[PDB]
Amino acid sequence: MRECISIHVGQAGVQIGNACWELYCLEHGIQPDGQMPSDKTIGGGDDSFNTFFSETGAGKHVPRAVFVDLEPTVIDEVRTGTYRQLFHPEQLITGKEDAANNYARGHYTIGKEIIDLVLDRIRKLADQCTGLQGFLVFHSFGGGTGSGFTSLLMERLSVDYGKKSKLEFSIYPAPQVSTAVVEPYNSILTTHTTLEHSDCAFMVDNEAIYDICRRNLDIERPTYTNLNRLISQIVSSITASLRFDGALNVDLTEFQTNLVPYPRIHFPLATYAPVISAEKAYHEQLSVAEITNACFEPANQMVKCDPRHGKYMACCLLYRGDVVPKDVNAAIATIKTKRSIQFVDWCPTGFKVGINYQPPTVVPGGDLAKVQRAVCMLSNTTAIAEAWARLDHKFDLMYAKRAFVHWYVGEGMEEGEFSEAREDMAALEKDYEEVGVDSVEGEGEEEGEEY
Amino acid sequence: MREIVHIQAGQCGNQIGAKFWEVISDEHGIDPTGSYHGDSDLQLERINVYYNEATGNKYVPRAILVDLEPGTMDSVRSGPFGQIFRPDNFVFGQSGAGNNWAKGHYTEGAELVDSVLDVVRKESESCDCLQGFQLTHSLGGGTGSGMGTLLISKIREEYPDRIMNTFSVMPSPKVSDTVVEPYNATLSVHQLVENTDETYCIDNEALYDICFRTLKLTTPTYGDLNHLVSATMSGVTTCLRFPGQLNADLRKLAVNMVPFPRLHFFMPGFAPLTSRGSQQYRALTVPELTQQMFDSKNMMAACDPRHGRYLTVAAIFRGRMSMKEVDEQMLNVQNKNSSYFVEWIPNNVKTAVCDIPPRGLKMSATFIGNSTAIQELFKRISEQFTAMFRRKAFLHWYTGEGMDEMEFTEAESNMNDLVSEYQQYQDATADE
Amino acid sequence: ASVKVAVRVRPFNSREMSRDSKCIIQMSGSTTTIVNPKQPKETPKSFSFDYSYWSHTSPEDINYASQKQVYRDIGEEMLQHAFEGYNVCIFAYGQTGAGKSYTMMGKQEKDQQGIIPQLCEDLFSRINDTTNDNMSYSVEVSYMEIYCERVRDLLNPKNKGNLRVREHPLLGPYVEDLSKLAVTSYNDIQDLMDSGNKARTVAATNMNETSSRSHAVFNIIFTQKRHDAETNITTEKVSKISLVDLAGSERADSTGAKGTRLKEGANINKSLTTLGKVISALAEMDSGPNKNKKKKKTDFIPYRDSVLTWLLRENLGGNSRTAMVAALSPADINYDETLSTLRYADRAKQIRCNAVINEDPNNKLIRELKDEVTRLRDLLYAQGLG
Amino acid sequence: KQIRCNAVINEDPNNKLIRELKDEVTRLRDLLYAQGLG
Ligand SMILES: CC(=O)O[C@H]1C(=O)[C@@]2(C)[C@H]([C@H](OC(=O)c3ccccc3)[C@]3(O)C[C@H](OC(=O)[C@H](O)[C@@H](NC(=O)c4ccccc4)c4ccccc4)C(C)=C1C3(C)C)[C@]1(OC(C)=O)CO[C@@H]1C[C@@H]2O
Ligand SMILES: Nc1nc2c(ncn2[C@@H]2O[C@H](COP(=O)(O)OP(=O)(O)OP(=O)(O)O)[C@@H](O)[C@H]2O)c(=O)[nH]1
Ligand SMILES: Nc1ncnc2c1ncn2[C@@H]1O[C@H](COP(=O)(O)OP(=O)(O)NP(=O)(O)O)[C@@H](O)[C@H]1O
Ligand SMILES: Nc1nc2c(ncn2[C@@H]2O[C@H](COP(=O)(O)OP(=O)(O)O)[C@@H](O)[C@H]2O)c(=O)[nH]1
Ligand SMILES: [Mg+2]
Ligand SMILES: [Mg+2]
């Protein structure tokens, strides 16, 4: 019973959750109303996989998900939509205003009186579970709710549960495009919590996804639905290892064991290789070598950062479909001989490999082609520091003049907190610069006693 | 009557064990339901080496399947020979080791080891005259390495006079599948060098090379590697089950292969291997088997014997053949390759012959070498180990489970001393 | 320094006086002559040892060596070395029923005591008289046995298990969870020793009525503290005295062992064979790198083949001043055994050692640099520059 | 008027004594070698 509890916070979290649960319902043969006709037609089976869905006596399947927001709008769209009968009616939406792009409003002022209900329902979901594996928290940097309330929730969860893994998928602010004037303050404030209380944070950038959609899928005018569907595919690839059989299965603990060298370096990038349109699915083989090479192309990264400017510290490749080990070994050997891809000298092995038999599914009305093979790569590297440094600069440009600060102090913060967060960020950045350095020449300086 | 208890740990161990039981059941003519449907009368004469009898004239293998992740167990039950095993021997828990040797050895395995030892005691107390144990596991993993080492230690504490065999898949230089293989391999070898009588080294690189180069397969999967390994396991213990012109028990191999207690890491091999389309050209006979036996590309450990010397070797033949030809061929192999054998062991080749070949072959043979070239493999792991222990690359996962740097340092020192001990006899001179 | 070698010939037992009672051991000064009872024409082969003791004739004054004589020759010097700040070891050797247990322990209810009694007596004395306001001493005791390649603790009997052997990177092998106890008076160490001797495993065989079944190691950790205002070295010396009583080699025909006794004898013989192999090699290699020339390429001494040689790695070679006391029987029938002991004793004479005084390395560097400053200051002042 | 604070690094007694004694040894040795007394 490899069970996982999903938590969606804020507008971005709820919409990514809509995409994710559409994909999960289609993978398992579950209808929008919760019934599964496959078991009725066959007579019984394991298709009600306990990773995501809980089965009642009548044959209905209720997801193991928790949606939270301070705006009634985003979740009232779900209560009256296609999937109104799938979710439990209890959706934890405060009938009040929103955090208003304010960390303080969502952490100190209004995040209270909704936190207790959220933890009570999370407790109820965790009591139903046997062998709970971890949490998957979806939220967004730069928002009020998605930053502050996620901070509070993560703190309380780390207090209560403690040992369970807590993975985090989040939308980092982009370098150029933005949807708010006070994004840097919220991001720098919530880094201080996501550094301590999470176990592994996967960051995605909307500019990168727009570029991938433009170049690969030939979509000139994408919306958030396409980005959410791509993120859903990635999360499904991560979690497939504990839902279907495979040659090599990689659980959620092996993730953290292999990709996290030190406790403060748990910020890997994520990429998905066979992102291609139906028309271009032809004229292409889509072999293991091609997709493994495409994972390492800088253009296909989901965060606007160049891996060639840093060094790879760990890689985890999760394959789906008609894949066999020998091609994976050949592809890894080919990648190890390229000079543009540099690994830190203190990690000779480098690669973790997992294989699953279930091929990826196609969502009707989607834009990804039907393929026989796929790979999701997760790479813990040092280039991510660049993605932070830009943000730091932006923060400084506003904090020298204390712009937009009185909104934060009016909601229960003091000024010094800002400085504290900034200092923490510098320390984290410094750590990356210390771990990518090559070991000192002949690490024991030199040696050579008698004989 | 000599009888063996079989233990399986982890994914690799479970899958190799399943294929091995398929092969053995085929050899003795056992139906997947457990009934006997053979032809020769000598199949049942020594069935009790591996199988217990059951009331409906059925036969149940004396196997113990162990893991910390339930899924692998299911893959064994939902298979061609899933129903043959008795369900009481499927011992497992939850919250698998997660590729962490500490979790397998100290934290998680410490709870399930009692149940596994209870089943081991139950199987061993019914034995007429227990010969030894054999364990299949992977050194480069989690639950396999840790719980195999823990079980080995406990059993050697409980049964000191018995034989402890071990078929281990250890990390390869090129083919890497997990990031922390060196840590697990080093600690596992530190345990094995103390608490084991024989250890057969198996490498995925060598098996892939055999499949590509000798068998000419285009898409080799893990089934074929399990096939080769299981053939080797059957070849090792052939002589306990069938008559022959010159028998060879496990103890005979141990005595004739191990000159000093710490040098018991063996390079296995099998012959013939013909690729399904060249067999019509090659004539099968003892010289051809011997030629393929000592060839470098046929070894299963990915260590070239030409880079060292053979402390000892053992050859077990199966089939009707002349002893004069066998002895002459082994003698010729010694004299012609005079530089790859030590000079302080006269006649360092052991010979055994069994009358009954495999089902589909007129002749067969297996090879168990003991050479200094194996040191290369250990050196490799040690190098990688240092590269990750100088900076403490992943040490917090292991130290959170109740370990310290002391254990890492002592394991590294023990491995280096083993490497030096093998290197002592590698170079020539020495003499008389 | 070299391994000190002492040999000691004992009197007859009941078994030897019942059967043929002809002696083959003769002795003079520091030379011991063996004579083959089967070949009277052959040369009386002789060996030279650093010490030789003759306990065959109790009342005679012809080089008779009581327990005290052996102690004043070996143990007093080793305790002097212990006060000098050196780790020291004395270990017994020979075959079954020769005198190891008697020499190291002796009989408590007599004026004939072993090395360990008199050594602790003299140590307690020397700390008692030399006590001062500034000088002080502390001593701790431990006692372990190796039964079947499993280490057991003697002082605390309720442990009831096999302790774990670990390897410190700097200090080498040691035993974890070993009940080291603090003592303050000779009565305390006497009580500990009696409890330990009662705790040891002893069984009766044809060769010996109280044959030992396990190797035994008695460890004394001794610390000198010299505290004064200026900078006087605090807790300066820390020495380890290791007194080792090994079980003897056995032959199944003469011993008459069966069942558990035979397995114990087999394990004892395995450990002793590994010890002999280690002794031979330390020897050859040292002698070579010493006489040969000085290449020092690589020599592998198999310490790890047994737990006994593993625990005694630093005593058989490296950082210790060690002495080997071999026991010898006079009877002709035991000839083929006794010669073997002597042969190994000869090889023990060749082994060397490298022992140095202990200190905090930071304080070591500080003291050395201060001495260098003082020397350079004196040189400059003498020549008119300082 | 936030001003630069600078860290409060100071000497470690053991390392301080070691460094100072090493420097003194080097200086005295250089003086001896310069005048031909070493
Ligand atoms: C004409 C004919 O009979 O064909 C052979 C054959 O072509 C060859 C190539 C067989 C064949 O093996 C392979 O193709 C193969 C593929 C991957 C990995 C390993 C083998 C054969 O499959 C394998 C099979 O071997 C056996 O049946 C042995 O008894 C073997 N048992 C099993 O393989 C087995 C399979 C399923 C279930 C249970 C057992 C065995 C070997 C040693 C010890 C015990 C048992 C045989 C004779 C053949 C085929 C069928 C083509 C070989 O088989 C072995 C290992 O004995 C591979 O080289 C040998 C020599 C043969 O010439
Ligand atoms: N990829 C993706 N990003 C989104 C989506 N919706 C919002 N975002 C990002 O989220 C950021 C704003 O934070 P929000 O998630 O809207 O914060 P919130 O949940 O509305 O919380 P409040 O500000 O208090 O209302 C914007 O910069 C968007 O880029 C989405 O559906 N997909
Ligand atoms: N020098 C000696 N003078 C007088 N009696 C001695 C002397 N050496 C040994 N003995 C006695 O002779 C016997 C043999 O000595 P003992 O110490 O028991 O040998 P052992 O090797 O320790 N026994 P074991 O454990 O089987 O090896 C004992 O009764 C001793 O008291
Ligand atoms: N020959 C063979 N090797 C395998 C098989 N499955 C896994 N392995 C090897 O085992 C290693 C992973 O160890 P694993 O079995 O996961 O250890 P565990 O988690 O403790 O069970 C990899 O390096 C693989 O090369 C198999 O079916 N056959
Ligand atoms: Mg909102
Ligand atoms: Mg004794």
Contacts of D12 in chain C (CB under 8 A): none
Q: Confirm if B30 and B160 have CB atoms less than 8 A apart.
A: no
End-to-end Cα spacing for chain C: 41
Q: Which residue of A has its CA nearest to C294?
A: A451
| CA angle (C13, C19, C21) in 5-degree steps | 70
Chain Cα centroid distance, residue A41? 36
Give CA separation, B121 vs B54, B117, B125, B154, B165, in Å: 19, 6, 6, 11, 17
Chains A and B touch (3+ CB pairs under 8 A): yes
- Please state, as a whole number, how many other Cβ atoms lie within 10 Å of the Cβ of residue B397: 23
**The residue to which tokens 């930071």 are assigned:** C362
Alpha carbon of A428 to ligand 2 centroid (Å): 25
Q: Can you list the domains of chain A with their CATH numbers?
A: 1-268 (3.40.50.1440), 269-383 (3.30.1330.20), 384-441 (1.10.287.600)
Taking the Cβ of residue C364 and every Cβ of chain D, the question of whether any pair is shorter than 8 Å is answered with no
**The residue to which tokens 């009600």 are assigned:** A48
Tokens representing C86 are 């050196």
* Secondary structure letter of residue B239 according to DSSP: G
Q: Confirm if A114 and A106 have CB atoms less than 8 A apart.
A: no
Sign of the torsion angle spanned by Cα atoms B64, B70, B71, B75: positive
Do the domains B2-259 and B260-373 sit in the same CATH topology, yes or no?
no
Give CA separation, A234 vs A198, A214, B206, C6, in Å: 19, 19, 35, 78
Tokens representing C316 are 């058989």
Cβ-based neighbours of A284, under 8 Å, separated by 6 or more: A276, A290
CA distance C289 to C294: 5
- Please state, as a whole number, how many other Cβ atoms lie within 10 Å of the Cβ of residue A87: 19
Angle (deg, nearest 10), helices B374-389 and B181-194: 130
CA distance A205 to A175: 9
- Beta strand C211-212 with C202-203: parallel, antiparallel or unpaired? antiparallel
Q: Confirm if B381 and B341 have CB atoms less than 8 A apart.
A: no
Give the gap in angstroms from C-alpha B391 to the nearest C-alpha of chain A: 7
| CA angle (B264, B266, B272) in 5-degree steps | 155
C106 in active site: no
Q: Is-cis flag, bond preceding B272, omega within 30?
A: yes
Q: What are phi and psi of A175, to 5 degrees?
A: -65, -50
Q: What is the CATH T-level fold of the domain B2-259, as seen in this structure?
A: Rossmann fold (3.40.50)
Q: Which of C166, C298, C304 sits opposite B417 (nearest CB)?
A: C304
**Best substitution site from B8, B103, B169 to test ligand 4's pocket, by max atoms within 8 Å of Cβ?**
B169
Domain boundaries along the sequence of chain B: 2-259, 260-373, 374-431
The answer to whether the annotation marks B146 as part of a ligand binding site is no
Q: Residues in chain C, how many?
A: 386
| CA angle (B14, A134, A13) in 5-degree steps | 135
CA distance C20 to C214: 30
Chain Cα centroid distance, residue C224? 22
- The torsion region of residue B22 among left (phi > 0), alpha (psi -120 to 50) and beta comes to alpha
Rg of chain C on CA atoms, in Å: 23
Binding-site residues of A for Mg(2+), in ranges, read 71
Residue type, C230: E
Helical (H) or strand (E) element with A167: strand A165-171
| CA angle (B419, B424, B429) in 5-degree steps | 150
Q: Confirm if A282 and A276 have CB atoms less than 8 A apart.
A: no
CA distance C142 to C163: 14
CA distance B195 to C149: 12
Residue type, C73: D
Give CA separation, A170 vs A146, A355, B82, in Å: 9, 26, 44
Q: What are phi and psi of B98, to 5 degrees?
A: 65, 40
Chain Cα centroid distance, residue A290? 24
Cβ-based neighbours of A433, under 8 Å, separated by 6 or more: A382, A385
CA distance B359 to B234: 12
Strand partners, B371: B310
**The residue to which tokens 């081991």 are assigned:** B120
Alpha carbon of B151 to ligand 2 centroid (Å): 53
Alpha carbon of C114 to ligand 3 centroid (Å): 11
**The residue to which tokens 């290791």 are assigned:** C242
How is chain B split among helix, strand and coil, in percent rounded to 5?
Answer: 45, 20, 35
CB contact under 8 A, B414 and C304: yes
DSSP symbols for B360-401 = T-S-EEEEEEEETTHHHHHHHHHHHHHHHHTTTSSHHHHHTT
Q: What is the CATH T-level fold of the domain B374-431, as seen in this structure?
A: Helix Hairpins (1.10.287)
Q: What are phi and psi of B108, to 5 degrees?
A: -85, -50
Taking the Cβ of residue A378 and every Cβ of chain B, the question of whether any pair is shorter than 8 Å is answered with no
Q: Which of A263, A314, A439 sits opposite B179 (nearest CB)?
A: A314
CA distance C306 to C273: 10
CA distance B340 to B348: 11
Taking the Cβ of residue D37 and every Cβ of chain C, the question of whether any pair is shorter than 8 Å is answered with yes
Q: What is the 3-state secondary structure (H, E, C) of chain C?
A: CECEEEEEECCCCHHHHHCCCCECEEEECCEEEECCCCCCCCCCCEEECCEEEECCCCCCCCCECCHHHHHHHHHHHHHHHHHCCCCEEEEEECECCCCHHHHHCECCCCCCECHHHHHHHHHHHHHHHCCCCCEEEEEEEEEEEECCCCEEECCCHHHCCCCCEEEECCCEEEECCCCCEEECCHHHHHHHHHHHHHHCCEECCCCCCCEECCEEEEEEEEEEEECCCCCCCCCCCEEEEEEEECCCECCHHHHCCCCHHHHHHHHHHHHHHHHHHHHHHHHHHHHHHHCCCCCCCCCCCCHHHCHHHHHCHHHHCCCCEEEEEEEECCEHHHHHHHHHHHHHHHHHHHCECCCCCCCCHHHHHHHHHHHHHHHHHHHHHHCCCC
CA distance C377 to D29: 10
- Beta strand C4-9 with A269-272: parallel, antiparallel or unpaired? unpaired
| Structure resolution, Å | 3.1
Q: Name which of B183, B142, B191 is nearest B9 in CA terms.
A: B142
Q: Which residue of C has its CA nearest to D28?
A: C376
Cβ-based neighbours of A14, under 8 Å, separated by 6 or more: A8, A67, A69, A74, A75, A78
- Beta strand C31-34 with A351-356: parallel, antiparallel or unpaired? unpaired
Give CA separation, A155 vs A11, A37, A148, A166, in Å: 21, 41, 11, 11
Q: What is the 3-state secondary structure (H, E, C) of A17-82?
A: HHHHHHHHHHHCCCCCCCCCHHHHHHCCCCCCCCCCEEECCCCCEEECEEEEECCHHHHHHHHCCC
Q: Which architecture characterizes domain B260-373 according to CATH?
A: 2-Layer Sandwich (3.30)
CA distance C322 to B409: 28
Q: Is the CB of A12 under 6 A from ligand 2?
A: yes
Residue type, A440: V
Tokens representing A222 are 């994408």
State the structure-solving technique: cryo-EM
**The residue to which tokens 């020449």 are assigned:** A441
* Secondary structure letter of residue A142 according to DSSP: T
Q: Tell me the CB-side half-sphere exposure of residue A288, using CA atoms within 13 A.
A: 21
Strand partners, A375: A319
**Best substitution site from B26, B229, B280, B364 to test ligand 1's pocket, by max atoms within 8 Å of Cβ?**
B26
Q: Which one of the ligands is nearest to B216 CA?
A: 1
Alpha carbon of C97 to ligand 3 centroid (Å): 5
CA distance C359 to C353: 19
Q: Is B118 helix (H, G, I), strand (E, B) or coil?
A: helix
CB contact under 8 A, D21 and C383: no
Tokens representing C142 are 């431990």
Q: Confirm if B103 and B93 have CB atoms less than 8 A apart.
A: no
CA distance A404 to A189: 14
Taking the Cβ of residue C293 and every Cβ of chain A, the question of whether any pair is shorter than 8 Å is answered with no
Give CA separation, A9 vs A23, A117, A156, A160, B246, in Å: 19, 14, 15, 19, 75
Cβ-based neighbours of B418, under 8 Å, separated by 6 or more: B189, B193, B262, B375, B378
Q: Which of A325, A326, A349 sits opposite B181 (nearest CB)?
A: A349
Strand partners, A61: A55
Give CA separation, C189 vs B159, B310, C219, C220, in Å: 38, 54, 12, 10
Helical (H) or strand (E) element with A218: none
Q: Is A234 helix (H, G, I), strand (E, B) or coil?
A: helix
Give CA separation, A449 vs A193, B412, C118, C310, in Å: 50, 20, 43, 25
Q: Confirm if A368 and A296 have CB atoms less than 8 A apart.
A: no
Strand partners, B54: B58
Q: Which residue of C has its CA nearest to A449?
A: C296
